[PDB]
Design an enzyme around this catalytic site. Structure first.
Site, mmCIF file in Angstrom:
data_model
loop_
_atom_site.group_PDB
_atom_site.id
_atom_site.type_symbol
_atom_site.label_atom_id
_atom_site.label_comp_id
_atom_site.label_asym_id
_atom_site.label_seq_id
_atom_site.Cartn_x
_atom_site.Cartn_y
_atom_site.Cartn_z
ATOM 1 N N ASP A 42 0.822 -1.207 0.000
ATOM 2 C CA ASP A 42 0.000 0.000 0.000
ATOM 3 C C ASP A 42 0.855 1.255 0.000
ATOM 4 O O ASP A 42 0.612 2.193 -0.766
ATOM 5 C CB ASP A 42 -0.925 0.023 1.217
ATOM 6 C CG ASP A 42 -2.084 -0.939 1.086
ATOM 7 O OD1 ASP A 42 -2.189 -1.608 0.036
ATOM 8 O OD2 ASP A 42 -2.891 -1.021 2.035
ATOM 9 N N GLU A 61 -7.340 7.874 11.396
ATOM 10 C CA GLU A 61 -8.318 8.130 10.340
ATOM 11 C C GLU A 61 -9.517 8.963 10.790
ATOM 12 O O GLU A 61 -10.670 8.585 10.574
ATOM 13 C CB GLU A 61 -8.774 6.795 9.742
ATOM 14 C CG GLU A 61 -7.642 6.064 9.036
ATOM 15 C CD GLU A 61 -7.987 4.640 8.650
ATOM 16 O OE1 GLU A 61 -9.026 4.115 9.106
ATOM 17 O OE2 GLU A 61 -7.199 4.037 7.894
ATOM 18 N N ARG A 76 -11.044 6.409 14.581
ATOM 19 C CA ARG A 76 -10.940 4.960 14.653
ATOM 20 C C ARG A 76 -9.899 4.580 15.698
ATOM 21 O O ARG A 76 -8.764 5.052 15.652
ATOM 22 C CB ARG A 76 -10.534 4.404 13.283
ATOM 23 C CG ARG A 76 -9.978 2.986 13.288
ATOM 24 C CD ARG A 76 -9.536 2.585 11.882
ATOM 25 N NE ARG A 76 -8.896 1.272 11.832
ATOM 26 C CZ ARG A 76 -8.583 0.647 10.702
ATOM 27 N NH1 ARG A 76 -8.859 1.215 9.533
ATOM 28 N NH2 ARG A 76 -8.000 -0.543 10.737
ATOM 29 N N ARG A 123 -16.839 -5.829 6.902
ATOM 30 C CA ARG A 123 -17.147 -4.573 6.241
ATOM 31 C C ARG A 123 -18.194 -4.808 5.160
ATOM 32 O O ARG A 123 -17.906 -4.749 3.961
ATOM 33 C CB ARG A 123 -15.874 -3.953 5.667
ATOM 34 C CG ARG A 123 -14.848 -3.623 6.740
ATOM 35 C CD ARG A 123 -13.492 -3.274 6.156
ATOM 36 N NE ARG A 123 -12.591 -2.764 7.188
ATOM 37 C CZ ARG A 123 -11.417 -2.193 6.943
ATOM 38 N NH1 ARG A 123 -10.994 -2.049 5.694
ATOM 39 N NH2 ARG A 123 -10.671 -1.750 7.946
ATOM 40 N N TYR A 141 -14.576 2.029 4.125
ATOM 41 C CA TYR A 141 -14.416 3.277 4.864
ATOM 42 C C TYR A 141 -15.611 4.201 4.653
ATOM 43 O O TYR A 141 -16.307 4.115 3.646
ATOM 44 C CB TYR A 141 -13.148 4.004 4.409
ATOM 45 C CG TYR A 141 -11.863 3.469 4.995
ATOM 46 C CD1 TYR A 141 -11.809 2.210 5.584
ATOM 47 C CD2 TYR A 141 -10.699 4.226 4.957
ATOM 48 C CE1 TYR A 141 -10.627 1.725 6.123
ATOM 49 C CE2 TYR A 141 -9.518 3.753 5.487
ATOM 50 C CZ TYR A 141 -9.487 2.501 6.074
ATOM 51 O OH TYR A 141 -8.313 2.022 6.609
#
Ligand SMILES: *[C@@H]1O[C@H](CO)[C@@H](O[C@@H]2O[C@H](CO)[C@@H](O[C@@H]3O[C@H](CO)[C@@H](O)[C@H](O)[C@@H]3O)[C@H](O)[C@H]2NC(C)=O)[C@H](O)[C@H]1NC(C)=O
Ligand SMILES: *[C@@H]1O[C@H](CO)[C@@H](O[C@@H]2O[C@H](CO)[C@@H](O[C@@H]3O[C@H](CO)[C@@H](O)[C@H](O)[C@@H]3O)[C@H](O)[C@H]2NC(C)=O)[C@H](O)[C@H]1NC(C)=O
Ligand SMILES: *[C@@H]1O[C@H](CO)[C@@H](O[C@@H]2O[C@H](CO)[C@@H](O[C@@H]3O[C@H](CO)[C@@H](O)[C@H](O)[C@@H]3O)[C@H](O)[C@H]2NC(C)=O)[C@H](O)[C@H]1NC(C)=O
Ligand SMILES: *[C@@H]1O[C@H](CO)[C@@H](O[C@@H]2O[C@H](CO)[C@@H](O[C@@H]3O[C@H](CO)[C@@H](O)[C@H](O)[C@@H]3O)[C@H](O)[C@H]2NC(C)=O)[C@H](O)[C@H]1NC(C)=O
Ligand SMILES: *[C@@H]1O[C@H](CO)[C@@H](O[C@@H]2O[C@H](CO)[C@@H](O)[C@H](O)[C@H]2NC(C)=O)[C@H](O)[C@H]1NC(C)=O
Ligand SMILES: *[C@@H]1O[C@H](CO)[C@@H](O[C@@H]2O[C@H](CO)[C@@H](O)[C@H](O)[C@H]2NC(C)=O)[C@H](O)[C@H]1NC(C)=O
Ligand SMILES: *[C@@H]1O[C@H](CO)[C@@H](O[C@@H]2O[C@H](CO)[C@@H](O)[C@H](O)[C@H]2NC(C)=O)[C@H](O)[C@H]1NC(C)=O
Ligand SMILES: *[C@@H]1O[C@H](CO)[C@@H](O[C@@H]2O[C@H](CO)[C@@H](O)[C@H](O)[C@H]2NC(C)=O)[C@H](O)[C@H]1NC(C)=O
Ligand SMILES: [Ca+2]
Ligand SMILES: [Ca+2]
Ligand SMILES: [Ca+2]
Ligand SMILES: [Ca+2]
Lengths: 394, 394, 394, 394
Positions: free
Chosen positions: C70, C197, C212, C292, C326
């Protein structure tokens, strides 16, 4: 925003410098680029654009197959910034059109696009993107126009149209417009003469046009008119022929008044241009006398006023091993240059595919564009550059 | 709109922060992205743009085949916003060009593009998108220029050109322009010296250039000039060589006046840059002494005025396992920063394909761009990232 | 142009209406669309934009293969108009970034992008497209930030950063900037708490953040600060947990002060948001307690000030059969609405591909975006809609 | 910027000239072009745009497979400049929507898009790109609207919505808005009448609508209302039916007050339009009485006020060998034309693929657009032009 005067004299220039090259067909090998014809250029106060006609088909797509007539219901006029490829995502829609002209009056873009049936066509006039007026066919025989920039002066825009036979006496008209409305028109009396695809530019407040005779002339018609649409019509005096097809220079005798033809040159031609330079003239022509290959521009001493054969300058911008096509005139306004005169420019179309390259199923063209400068400039050969055949041809 | 003064001192900076990375080749694996070289950057008052040269061929298309010489009739200068990929649909056409420079004077973009034959090339100057002037080859031997941003101060824009042999004495000229018109020029006397591909920036109202010697020097020429085109010319004093190819630092002795070469370094080089910092200098170079791989920037104490070997800071922005290429200088104007000095920035070209990667038929590059800041900044390795070979290579 | 005050109270809203859906992955089946994460939204006076991170790889291209970490040198922050797909030709380059935040102060866009090595990362601050400042890692452990809109009030812009371990005590800082220059910073003391975040919005001249906890909390941290960077920190009081993973509501007891976790929920989480509504709170969460998937928003009576379990409204915008991801907060300024309060909005990310869909080699996401209105609004399920696997997966 | 008055009388026109043709499906054979329906047009002071609904799928992509219902969570309203193809890179996102209307008040664009479940749909009103208000379904039965331009006068914008059964008595409402806020609404009492898909235009400060009866009428409903939402409702008086399906003219007797149907015409229809011309009317219709093929426009003498069968002009713009579809009305404001009246224009949708062309897996449409002019204009046949089936169909 104000109207562009555009009443200045045309600049005297000693050479032509390359300004842009769109490389559209090379790009269209993979990119999404329209198959086009007549990539003509027109300039506003702060911007030049390449206009073009397309069938609404992309390079390397099956719809580019030459299975539809030129004058189709799909044909459209579009534009991109000068130098851009005629691609699917930068293109701006201008008009439905299988014949067109466009120009800018200082405030807005004017686009004139002809569509409809051969026996009842009509031009739609677009001003600032809005439909404002129409011109109907008056002879009911393929109403058609310049395929290059029109001319705007003092807020009035002018263009030339033809209606009638391709290879015999037709009818020719000049139009005047203001903000997209036709405000005047005049038929040009030209018995024995033939006018097609005029390349026009402003010069000291008059419109000067160099056209194509598709009948009896291998010399180019000249049409000059003023704001009243009073006009003078005749032929480029020069003893150097500049249409294609034509004969070799030594076999040609010029005329200011009459079409000069024969010797297998009758009934065809190609769109081209010239620029008056006082009494002289810059004239473009294909290098080949018979085919649309190569391109050169000649400065002919006193060529605007007498049958001169004196070539004082010649520059080649495309060699005879490469395909050319139509060429046309435009000018750059004072509002971007540091000059007190209008800069003469021309565009050159380079056709690829049919009819000359029969292993391809399609026909398109790309362009190079040149502007006059105060000094001599060397030539070169800036060819289209696409490698044919294309994927779709296999 | 007003002309940018650009007469401020260059900022003293202690590090360089990454500003952009275009990822063009990665994107071009599937997207429609030009095959390019020299992704140089230039900034106007409110906008920075990446300029680049292309053959008008897209990545993964047959036209990207390396079968055409660099100086071709297809070569064009285009631009996109800084950080954008050099793609077919965001690209803005700037000039026909196989060599180029561009900059912004506060009011309009200036683009200088050279085309034509090797023995009679000419630059066309574009201002606000309009052709304004030309510069002809004066030695008839590959007229060429910076391949990076030119410099504008107080409405005048300046650039450096070369004409003559690649590997022996050539001729070097400085040009001054206003609104696209050449207003002054001067030949730089530099016997025994060689100047190519200058990276220039404004500093306290003078133009400072760090160039490439393609003859006898592995040290970089320095050329400094003012509004009158009065100049000083010589070599970067530092006892650290920054061209490629070069020898290891310990085998090099600096000179302010003479080209220092030999040891297999003669007759080649790479475009690079440096920034004066009072008496010191930030200088970029490839990590490898022999190949265009890796990239680092060194702060050399008193390196602008004496043969210093004292390296006070060094930052690596690309490791030696990755291909680099050309690098060039530009500055950010005061009109966007909260500073009273001009921010020094550089771009780095990362070349992929031929000649180093012979399993590919094409050559392109992508860029990273960095700007100086008032504090130290860590390095890293921001490589091109494309996975070769590509589809077209199979 | 003037700075946006943005000191108004946040609107009280009774429902959320869908504003946009980009359909990016569906489009990217054939179009040229980036593989992305975190499609966050930020609004200026006259314009909202979707920002996103990309590896510079396109959907259905080999470079989308999940073979790069990432935090890579290729990762970039870009933006498109709200509702547009994150495509190759509309995208605007914002910053090099593997973590980011962005916002608009009324005059210009601010973009903060972090790159570099894990042990020495740095943020580059971009203002009006120009690099203006840097923030270095202070704990040398993956400097990171909001992945959503920052907040600007009265010409100052604010954001939250974290540096340190992912699953134990880290360090948290608030930053204040003016025209891209950091003008103040403050470390937030939060022993036993964890902040990642943050989703932040303006409310009566203070910044309110819902974050978070990636350590011991399945409840979300709340951080509120003012122009001096004076702050209050704690947890969302509500007796309804809103992180993922979490336990069922009936197994949870709220806390205003302490992280509440265990029961297999420790050491993970997901970015989410909430909006204070006087003493109550609108809070988003996945429908699933463990994965999620799905998305709903709950109005919890007095949930901002006490451990309430009273849910007065609930709206589902994505059913549990569909992948979410998200979510983040932003607001619409007064300068486009007919209101005297700031409209609360959220974006929802819907992740496709890995890790949940293992037959694909890539991971991307698309978005839906919703804004609060004065009346109740029905829910529905607006899922991503792409049909996987894709061509490249075969 | 000021609000457009738009209170002028509608122009009396004697013909309709073609303004644009998008060629979207032809282009989409290779380019990246959305699969669309209802390419309606709306004009602001200086710009006309084509709006359209899409499933977020591109031509020649698997997502274009007709495997999703029309009212899906993927359906979106987008726009491009008039004449542009509905492509992935020029498209502007307007609203989530499976039913929509849009218009411009002189200052900003208004877009109204309906989404959600059939039994609880809601319209989101977008003004200047910001969500401003909502309208909830009041009958809980597929809230739906015009699928063409709304009407703005003096800063207020108006549109018509329907909620209820498709083939029996439903409920019809008129809405008034200012800057995206609903400021008034009125239910239209129309027992025995049915209103769908209204085509509305301004005329002397009132809104005049010609709609679709999907119940008992092959004649079109007429709805006229003013700023107070006071209204008159009935049917187009003309003894010429203009819906599809319908019976031959000679088998039809008109009515100003009652739906006239039967003879196999009940329970269907097509969106269409008409323009009042004093006491007369221009009305569009398919050439076929049973199928959506061909298109013609008729000037019916006194057709607005009595059951006249006198057709004084008829123009065909698409022959009966070609597929048509929906058609709708809009007007060009005074702020671009040299007129003191509002120019009536219409768009024509030409549907390709399913249901008529069953060898294709997809359905899309392209458009032609026409504006009224002061003189007669010849017709022609400007068909879609795509060659089916497409690659994806094999
Ligand atoms: C461009 O248009 C040309 C002309 O229509 C197309 O060429 C023709 O294509 C058809 C269909 O493939 C060919 O007909 C076929 O021949 C095969 C072989 O015997 C036969 O099995 C089929 O029954 C059919 O008769 C035809 O031979 C071919 N050439 C012509 C007419 O000269 C061409 O396909 C088009 N190209 C594209 C890309 O659309
Ligand atoms: C890029 O340019 C190179 C060089 O022109 C191309 O490579 C060459 O391609 C030609 C044509 O395919 C090859 O010639 C052929 O070889 C086959 C095998 O014997 C033979 O049947 C044909 O008669 C012909 O001689 C050639 O081998 C090949 N390689 C070279 C010249 O080194 C290449 O195709 C170009 N790539 C693209 C994508 O355009
Ligand atoms: C995405 O990345 C994955 C992982 O690298 C790629 O999968 C792997 O691809 C390689 C190369 O094709 C495969 O190796 C080959 O296996 C064949 C069959 O025996 C053998 O002949 C070759 O010598 C080689 O070993 C590998 O099996 C495959 N799968 C793995 C590693 O799990 C994949 O190709 C990438 N996809 C794209 C689109 O780039
Ligand atoms: C568009 O949607 C249609 C309908 O789903 C798709 O047609 C169907 O595609 C499936 C999958 O290929 C076919 O099922 C297969 O038949 C083969 C042959 O026996 C069998 O081996 C497989 O097990 C499977 O049953 C189906 O026959 C086919 N046609 C239908 C359902 O009428 C089509 O593929 C879609 N097109 C695109 C481009 O996505
Ligand atoms: C272009 O050159 C022509 C020819 O030399 C110039 O025209 C002359 O202008 C002078 C000064 O007004 C007159 O005395 C001559 O009678 C003109 N000759 C002809 C043949 O017209 C013209 O001025 C030049 N144009 C520009 C813009 O410099
Ligand atoms: C960059 O640093 C240089 C070197 O310290 C600065 O130049 C000095 O400036 C002072 C004050 O004017 C002079 O007294 C010295 O003589 C200068 N030294 C040299 C070597 O020139 C310069 O001011 C700095 N530039 C900026 C923009 O801060
Ligand atoms: C949102 O609702 C809250 C709660 O009702 C409002 O806050 C109250 O405002 C009144 C009037 O100023 C005060 O008397 C109360 O003390 C407030 N209550 C709380 C809990 O703060 C608030 O005004 C509303 N916001 C908007 C923009 O309408
Ligand atoms: C369009 O034509 C209609 C019909 O001729 C015009 O309406 C007439 O206008 C005159 C002058 O105001 C009146 O005396 C008549 O009573 C009107 N007749 C009807 C049936 O309304 C109208 O003026 C024309 N519109 C435009 C813009 O020219
Ligand atoms: Ca001829
Ligand atoms: Ca060297
Ligand atoms: Ca957690
Ligand atoms: Ca009906």
């Amino acid at each position: 925003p104000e109207f562009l005067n555009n009443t200045e004299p045309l600049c005297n220039v000693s050479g032509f410098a390359i300004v842009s090259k769109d490389n559209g067909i090379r790009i269209g090998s993979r990119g999404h680029v329209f198959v086009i014809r007549e990539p003509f250029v027109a300039c506003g106060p702060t911007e030049c654009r390449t206009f073009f006609l397309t069938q609404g088909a992309l390079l390397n797509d099956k719809h580019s197959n030459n299975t539809v007539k030129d004058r189709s219901p799909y044909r459209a006029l579009m534009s991109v910034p000068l130098g851009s490829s005629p691609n699917a995502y930068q293109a701006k829609f201008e008009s439905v059109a299988w014949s067109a002209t466009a120009c800018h009056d200082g405030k807005k873009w004017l686009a004139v696009g002809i569509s409809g049936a051969d026996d009842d066509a009509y031009a739609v006039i677009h001003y600032g993107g809005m439909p404002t007026d129409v011109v109907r066919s008056w002879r009911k025989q393929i109403l058609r126009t310049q395929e290059s920039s029109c001319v705007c002066m003092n807020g009035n825009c002018y263009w030339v149209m033809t209606d009638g036979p391709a290879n015999s006496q037709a009818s020719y008209k000049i139009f005047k417009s203001h903000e997209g409305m036709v405000t005047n028109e005049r038929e040009v009396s030209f018995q024995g003469g033939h006018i097609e695809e005029c390349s026009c530019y402003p010069n000291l407040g008059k419109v000067e046009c160099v056209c194509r005779d598709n009948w009896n002339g291998m010399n180019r018609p000249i049409l000059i008119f003023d704001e009243d649409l009073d006009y003078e019509v005749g032929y480029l005096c020069a003893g150097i022929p500049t249409d294609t097809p034509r004969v070799q220079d030594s076999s040609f005798t010029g005329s200011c008044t009459n079409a000069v033809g024969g010797s297998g040159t009758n009934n065809y031609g190609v769109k081209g241009f010239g620029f008056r330079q006082g009494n002289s003239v810059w004239a473009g022509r294909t290098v080949s006398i018979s085919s649309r290959s190569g391109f050169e521009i000649l400065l002919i001493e006193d060529g605007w006023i007498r049958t001169s054969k004196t070539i004082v300058k010649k520059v080649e911008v495309l060699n005879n091993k490469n395909w050319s096509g139509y060429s046309g005139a435009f000018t750059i306004p004072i509002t971007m240059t540091s000059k007190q005169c209008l800069v003469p420019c021309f565009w050159l179309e380079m056709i690829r595919g049919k009819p000359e390259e029969r292993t391809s199923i399609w026909t398109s063209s790309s362009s190079t564009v040149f502007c006059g400068v105060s000094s001599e400039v060397p030539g070169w050969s800036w060819d289209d550059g696409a490698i044919l055949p294309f994927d779709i041809d296999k």
